[PDB]
Symmetry: D3
Subunit: 337 residues, 6 copies
């Protein structure tokens, strides 16, 4: 019911819970202070292009706890969100510049592609009545009796941290509507949204990839055909650095010594990452390294779709519901863009 | 209801009236924006050392309309105000950095000299029970029929502009303020001295007959009329452009009369409505002349003259102490021929 | 082709002419500097909530020279502008937060109500294909060689200044299209966009209003039944002012003495203005003073549309294509008070 | 003697030592630069609500090296500090907005509650003449001839880092005065001031709690009545984290997997801390997790003070010289749930 | 005591006099505050690209009172300035951004063209020994009894305000003398005309011709000074009759037009160091606009002098007239033994 | 050809490659945003005193990948650089306030000491034509500065099979030079790697074994280098590698007064948490351990008090010496 109120909620509850109360608030440049006793504590720092007080409010009104991965929602063309805001924790910014019934400043009028949270009363109804829109739910929408064509997710984010199923089940179901018309498209591959430091294997294959030597691993999974000498492992034997087009391959290399990734831009909503990687111990490096995080199993399966029977070609493979062009030689070198 | 409510009030009522409503607010740098439709408007720019949003709130909670002159309140040592802020429109800041029961951020717990508005409920009580305090009132505090001793003002400020009692000619208009002081759990027995009129160079209007004649009459006629021959206004007051360094220009009114006959520029080192003794660089273009440090105050010409007649002109050098805005001020006197050579402050 | 190109244009031409060249540009806080020789010159100071470099660019790409009044277009609900931006010189910002084919950062892909300039090639066509749009032109738009229905204006803005037809002819024609269809009805009056300092009278009445002793004016123009000595002229003999609901009333007063006016928000796109007014010489004030800048002629027109036999009537009068609630009080078959909001 | 002097001190000696010299200084926004040769170096970034140059000065004049823990002082009502500032290396600001004889801008004179350093000459004398004051010292104050009641601490901070007596002896004695009279006695427990990453055991019980399985440990210290598993150890078994109401329990948990804690507000002067804890390996979050850092020995001797014969209870426990409420749900001859707030 | 000391000087004496004292100072954004009692007063606002505390100091170290015109100094290639700064009061920035022995932050090592004030000890020595440099003086350098070649100005600025030599007795003499050194030796020749410092608002006539120009109906003026062969009703006086304005290439043209009605002029970049001004002019009462209007402040006498030196036969020619020690291109068109257009650039 | 062009390059290629095309750019305070779709991503945060947009430009035009150590180049008096920019990744500012043919705003007309890159055409020529100047090359050219180490994308790197070298040449007052000390390796506490088998031993070996093996018994390491937590005041830690070994045994915290990659003699406040001690000032260097030892054996045992001058990164440094006849060694 005001900035001071928002501050109170955040200082105490960590987010905006609608709780009643107020704290004195100072806005200096990109910083937000709240006065406690005789001194001011800095509760927020603005990383966005929005007015600080506003960016603060949006962050307070963010969806808290378990949340859907942002990368897909970005690709789906989402513009405004309804009665809530998705926070990109890496980028330290909201997923959108636009909002519906959240913040008087960011609130938006004209009809536009809009994301709906199914845990919010009356959202789903508004979804079906929308020409263009997206909806996500913890549970599969029933019409009628079994399921709807959807996007199924065994993973997601918890308080901004990459999370996934293990006995805990994490599930997301995404639905899409274009030009008045629902869609059955929905395929085939999705990024796991894991970072370098906190990376944990989500599969038994990934469990093995980090531990086993290249030979025993390759032999085990029958990857002998595909050449990992260059790609998917990476080679410091050369001054210019081979492979590392998977988030997971970098993780293995950082176990063998000091690996530094500096991304050009950083966001959790980006499907295809681009960084500059440097390996210190045997000093190779890659000025432009294009990578993305895939469940290794999902990646191998996309290798199965290939052949040694062409010299070169573009395969576009479908990830986060976009075409992504990968370039190939023969198997010798493989990589996106 | 907070910032967005304050914004609503200011945009609509011009100040904070405790009206109900909200406008979305943006804070960028020193600027306060309200969003009306598809565009943002600029309602405030921060001239203070406070957080932009706080300065804005303090400004909205400022006393509006008729207000007392700020200089006397400063000279009385007011640290904080109770349930109001006084805005210095010259300085574009509050009279104080501290408040009681106004803003959560600037509210101050510790015991200080506090100013009280007698127009506000509960103030007189807090004041008479206060060890050190100041109180101002638009009507005289009276123990029956007989007025308690006070600082008595026939002038004041209106929305940041200097006003005063006037006849209206072709019908009176009375501006009055009354100011009461408490030091060490006791009232003060008497108030004396002179008060500065708070006028500025552009908007200056004469508040007396003498001040009217000063701006109109040629120097001879004026001096002749008021019997001023011994004080030699020709230097001390009027100011002299004949030389390359300016004459006195020690009164606000001196600069006004001079700016009628040519181009006069005055740059103040610091500008505030609460400063009783002001300092500027003065420049007169038409007959180029300058004063790098020009110390002036705005005094009713009648009061300044009054002071002169209190002077012993037989003396060679003398340092006179003159009470203005309830403070002692130091003024240098040099005489010859039993007439004034120089009379200036500091 | 960039910030440096734009700076070159502004510093030289005073606007973006698409002319070729570059100057070194420094952005510090809300200030924009061009480096000339060994020193940096201050060019733009940013009064907007937009990024300092964007506000500069939009200011550079603003329509220069003669421009249409901003008030109406704001009321017509314009979200965006096509191949140009309109500058509000009072507000020191654009009329809109959005543009179409102007600036990459502010360019908006979706469907919103858009203002179109006819002088700009390609615009009229896009105007008629738009579901909701506005368009303005310096010349009438004819279908059958006979003019289309339009908002017709004898005045406007020149380089952020208020000018009028006066041998000098200034004309604007405004056309709206809402919900797939044009609009056949424009009724109302319009605000002249003048301000207190630069105010010039645009009629014979106005000239007379300013020069003539009131009551001679009251007589010659036959307003006796009207309250003007209160409702218009304004009354300084009381601690509270009254009247001053027209710009021109303040203008006549500022001539009589020292009149100060602080607007709560300043914009050239605002129809109904609000400010605190103060008069020093016979001290008087109005804390909330709502005012217009209507042609005095247009105001008198409204006064004669009134039923003076009433007690309290709230009239809705059309100004700048919007209804505006006005409170009338009558006494002895004369106006007691007439004011807005 | 001036901003440029202060910068000379900081760039060379790390703090303000009163050394003579000057360096050219640039204040841009929240940043402070010194010019060394042809380039500017960034000395300081301003995290405070204070003007950048003032925060830089206060940071320079901060008490350096061995310092008292800030939580007690904050809680004790401390307003101004006298001839020193205390820096909070977490919050990156001073313990106070006000000072006495330190910085001309922050220097404030009207009597208030003032903290005094005994290593600073003249202070004790000023402490005893103060109506409301606080004194701290590295050595006990005697009189007459024996001792004085005090808050005694075996731990402190060193250059913003948590340290305890461990062959090194670390001691602080804090004294208080209200209403012209000394403070009769001091009670309660004290937070250790440690943090999740830099945590070190201050006691043998703490060492064991970290290195031992439950029930080897619980058996050894005979805590069986108090139910530790759900109340302390922070079982991740469920979707909502349990336990984690002590720093040390969050430390033991971060050994077994990835534990994230986002604090709403960071300060080293804060007694009762509140964050959002996340555990990735077997996912669980406590959206609001209120915790303290208490010597585990001090926590247990709190538990033994409890009455386990009651069902619903609110216990008031004194920590850092303030009462704090904990809820005791204990059911039968044991503890069901014990948590603060 | 640096910043706090400088502040004490500005708040009290108006500039830095090397008085002793300290005031607590707060730098917030582009603003400089001093604490007086319980409140901060705002003493400075930074319009420069320099750090705020630095621009405050350079301003305090500005030359105060009577100062030389900054246009010539800029044109002469001045880069740094020795033991003083010159403040441009219009642009609210220094003339330089580089200093020699002024401010530790702004101070410069490498050899560059430097300006010297002759009232400052050590200055003339360094100037005569400089390979490139400029000197200015309130008094002529003379040897002996006879004055070396210089730039003689009877006008100048006073506290940022344009003043000039002026006259009931009443002579106030304003004089500046400028000396240049390029490539290890003096320049022997100074020619051309000089712009005054005047602005539209504070403008004052410096000659009888200018007084008459302002007070006289055109053609009474034109008759009196015999200007008929020149276009003055256009190309000087300026013409509100059409949509595009025209004329107004002199500061004094705008001034005269400014007293006949409402005239607005908005400069593209404002400075006191600029010889050739460029703005956008608008006349409200008879609506007219010159979108790009280039003009100068020239003694009307000096301009009339340029006109009479023109060849009135030739159809079109580019003229070069030297103003503020730089060549400026003026375009000429002659109709029949008379001016058609005469304009800068 | 502009800011929007630069942004395009940076977001895509990581630096300015001259590639064509543009992206929408927002400048707020010290932050630089590029608009991508419906959101603005934050590309750059300005740590310099330069205009935000300029600093961003200089960062983009920086030399990328393999670079020379800046310590030397600072000391040689380098003022402007020619058609390139050297970035200090620790200070997050460039090496100079000036440039020659790089950025229109930072570009400088007057003649000054100028560093040249020899992988840039027309450089060596302009270098030899220059009154005072500096040149660095990936290959030799003659008297030089031989460096088997350097920086890679802002990381301290060096030779081990991977060979990396740098050659530096100087001119002063219209003539070449003859140059000649040791050089700092530019490593940092966290990312430290031993570049010499001796250092490899220093970290991994207990003290006595180390001192006996390399025969350092005379001058006691247990004080001067290894560092000693015993006293309330730390002591030792005048080397980078000395702090790296201490951080192995517990919690070590250093706070530098000023952080730069171009700095030779480092300074900072050091603290050991596990067995508390602090050094308030602690000036220190990163020297190849072998090269520091070679300094010790140029020393006189027989003097009670001696002030030694040593050349590190082409600069004289005052080192303090007392002997037990061996006792105390440390700078400034």
């Amino acid at each position: 019911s005001g900035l001071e109120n928002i501050a109170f909620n955040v200082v105490n509850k960590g987010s905006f819970v609608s709780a009643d109360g107020e704290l004195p608030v100072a806005i200096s440049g990109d910083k937000v202070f709240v006065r406690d006793g005789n001194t001011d504590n800095l509760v927020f720092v603005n990383k966005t292009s929005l007015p600080t007080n506003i960016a603060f409010e949006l962050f307070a009104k963010r969806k808290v706890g378990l949340t859907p991965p942002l990368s897909i929602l970005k690709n789906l063309g989402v513009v405004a969100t309804y009665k809530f805001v998705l926070w990109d924790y890496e980028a330290e910014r909201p997923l959108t510049s636009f909002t519906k019934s959240v913040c008087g400043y960011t609130d938006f009028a004209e009809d536009v592609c809009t994301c709906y949270d199914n845990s919010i009363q009356g959202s789903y109804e508004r979804f079906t009545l929308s020409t263009n829109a997206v909806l996500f739910s913890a549970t599969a929408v029933k019409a009628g009796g079994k399921s709807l064509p959807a996007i199924k997710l065994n993973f997601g984010m918890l308080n901004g941290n990459a999370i996934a199923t293990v006995i805990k089940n994490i599930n997301w179901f995404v639905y899409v509507r274009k030009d008045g018309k629902p869609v059955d498209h929905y395929d085939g591959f999705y990024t796991q949204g894991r970072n370098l430091q906190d990376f944990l294997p989500r599969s038994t294959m990934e469990e093995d990839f980090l531990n086993m030597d290249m030979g025993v691993f390759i032999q085990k999974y029958g990857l002998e055909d595909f050449n990992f000498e260059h790609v998917v492992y990476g080679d410091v034997s050369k001054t210019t650095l081979g492979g590392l087009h998977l988030s997971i391959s970098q993780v293995r290399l950082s176990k063998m010594g000091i690996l530094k990734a500096e991304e050009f831009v950083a966001a959790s909503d980006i499907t295809l990452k681009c960084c500059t990687v440097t390996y210190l111990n045997d000093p190779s490096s890659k000025t432009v390294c294009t990578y993305m995080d895939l469940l290794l199993d999902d990646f191998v399966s996309v290798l199965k779709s290939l052949d040694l029977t062409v010299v070169s070609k573009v395969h576009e493979v479908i990830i986060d519901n976009k075409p992504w062009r990968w370039m190939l030689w023969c198997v010798a070198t493989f990589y996106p863009q």
